[PDB]
């Protein structure tokens, strides 16, 4: 229980979140995504995904500096006759490859999608529109979206949701950064990547879909540098 919100667990690097506001930092439920047979994966950025969550987003945009750990709870239930496996990875500094011949050309509005996040692709497509480039991420699942083999992503803090065994995953991420505190609007400290390690299947049904829900609670929150409100440009 954290605040008025209530409900194996993995503590990233064995380090519980710690201090170097209090009401605002509680469990928030993002929009549900649909796991299909042909799904490739999903990603979110923290604190970006929580930027429109009650008082936590207000504190994000009213302060120059902020820091927080997180507790991420992935929820996905199915029957005993379903099969499939998900890998949930927490990546510090989760930089994703772009889609253009120009290096680092992804624009701010696409790098910070919010609680909807983005999806991995099965292959790499190069954006050719030069007059109006998309300037979006093109994260390939087997390259883990950053030019590394997804099979080695298990070096990151992670959990596995095997449908025959468990239906939930819990990751406790401490604040990780080269600084004690940073700008929450400039920098995403954590990334969450969910990849289907084993494809979803249900007997004699090429139609089954099951929901995945993420609930994220910021922890050990600190804010500093109160000023007027930041209003980032949107697309």
């Amino acid at each position: 229980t954290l605040g008025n919100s209530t409900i194996n667990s993995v503590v990233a690097y064995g380090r519980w979140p710690e201090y170097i506001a209090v009401a605002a930092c509680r469990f928030y439920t993002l929009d549900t995504v649909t796991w299909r047979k042909e799904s490739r994966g999903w990603w979110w950025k923290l604190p970006d995904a929580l930027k429109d969550m009650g008082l936590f987003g207000q504190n994000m945009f009213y302060h120059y500096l902020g820091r927080a750990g997180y507790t991420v709870h992935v929820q996905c239930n199915a029957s005993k006759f379903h099969q499939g496996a998900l890998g949930v990875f927490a990546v510090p500094e989760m930089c994703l490859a772009g889609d253009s011949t120009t290096h680092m050309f992804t624009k701010y509005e696409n790098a910070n999608p919010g609680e909807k996040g983005g999806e991995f692709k099965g292959s790499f497509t190069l954006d050719t529109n030069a007059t109006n480039p998309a300037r979006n991420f093109c994260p390939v699942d087997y390259l883990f979206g950053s030019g590394v083999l997804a099979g080695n992503a298990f070096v990151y803090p992670h959990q596995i949701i095997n449908l025959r065994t468990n239906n939930c995953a819990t990751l406790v991420l401490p604040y990780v950064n080269s600084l004690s505190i940073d700008s929450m609007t400039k920098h995403n400290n954590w990334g969450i990547a969910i990849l289907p390690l084993a494809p979803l299947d249900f007997a004699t049904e090429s139609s089954t879909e099951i929901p995945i829900t993420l609930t994220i609670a910021p922890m050990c929150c600190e804010f500093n540098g109160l000023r007027n409100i930041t209003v980032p440009r949107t697309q």
């Binding site: 990233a12 690097y13 064995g14 380090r15 005993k80 006759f81 379903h82 099969q83 499939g84 496996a85 510090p92 099965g122 699942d141 087997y142 083999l149 997804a150 099979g151 080695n152 298990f154 070096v155 596995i160 095997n162 449908l163 025959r164 065994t165 401490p174 990780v176 950064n177 080269s178 004690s180 990849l195 289907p196 390690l197 084993a198 494809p199 299947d201 249900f202 007997a203 004699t204």
Partner: protein, 234 residues
């Protein structure tokens, strides 16, 4: 001044030397470190992390996610192997690009035990027993469960538990093996077989996937740092 005599090796630059040099920014006030999570002291700590094995490197599967999945079915029992692996953790293409293999490709000599974990990703209604075997080198690679049973092995009941670990203990004539394909320092064979068949009830998927992970044990060590073949510049 003091009489001195210049020995051979004077004025050479050895890139592996350990010498003092003058500081180009004296009296710099260095930023103190903070307690960042996830500090690493030894590269072996990374080799001791389980990473998924790209076992299914077929023409249509390599360089996709399908290369990580090995398919089982509920067909009748057979003695044909499910998977066959060479115990060459740095030169076998299926182990070379795991975290363990990537670390090994920066060194010339390796020794120590290995850990292979297998995760069954079928329905909860599926049952079956599998045999996982390691054969030390020297004989022909086992092609049936009869030959595989003679080596080290474990029996995995998926119904009882969804993940099973087999430790391959260090057994070598030499004190270290080379990180390349070499007959004199060959490692052996890892094989998987059906002990019984996989059984499912009705209204259940009849095909399912297993996944493989490999890591090093606490007795693992490497020697003779060297450049890798996994990165090149054009």
């Amino acid at each position: 001044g003091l009489p001195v005599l210049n020995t051979p090796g004077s004025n050479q630059y050895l890139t592996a030397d350990n010498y003092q040099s003058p500081c180009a920014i004296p009296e710099f006030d260095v930023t103190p470190p903070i307690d960042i999570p996830g500090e690493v002291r030894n590269m072996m700590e990374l080799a001791e992390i389980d990473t998924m094995i790209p076992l299914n490197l077929t023409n249509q599967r390599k360089n996709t996610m399908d290369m990580y999945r090995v398919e089982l079915n509920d067909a009748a029992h057979s003695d044909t192997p499910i998977l066959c692996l060479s115990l060459s953790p740095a030169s076998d293409p299926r182990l070379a690009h795991t975290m363990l293999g990537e670390i090994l490709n920066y060194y010339t000599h390796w020794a120590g035990s290995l850990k292979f974990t297998f995760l069954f990703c079928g329905s909860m209604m599926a049952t079956g027993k599998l045999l996982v075997s390691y054969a030390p080198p020297g004989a022909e690679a086992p092609k049936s469960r009869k030959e595989a049973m003679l080596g080290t092995h474990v029996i995995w009941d998926i119904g009882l538990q969804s993940s099973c670990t087999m430790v391959v203990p260090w057994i070598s004539n030499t004190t270290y093996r080379l990180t390349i394909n070499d007959s004199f320092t060959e490692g052996g064979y890892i094989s998987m077989f059906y002990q019984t068949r996989v059984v499912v009830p009705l209204s259940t998927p009849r095909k399912m996937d297993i996944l493989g992970f490999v890591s090093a044990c606490n007795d693992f060590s490497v020697r003779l740092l060297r450049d890798t073949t996994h990165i090149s510049q054009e």
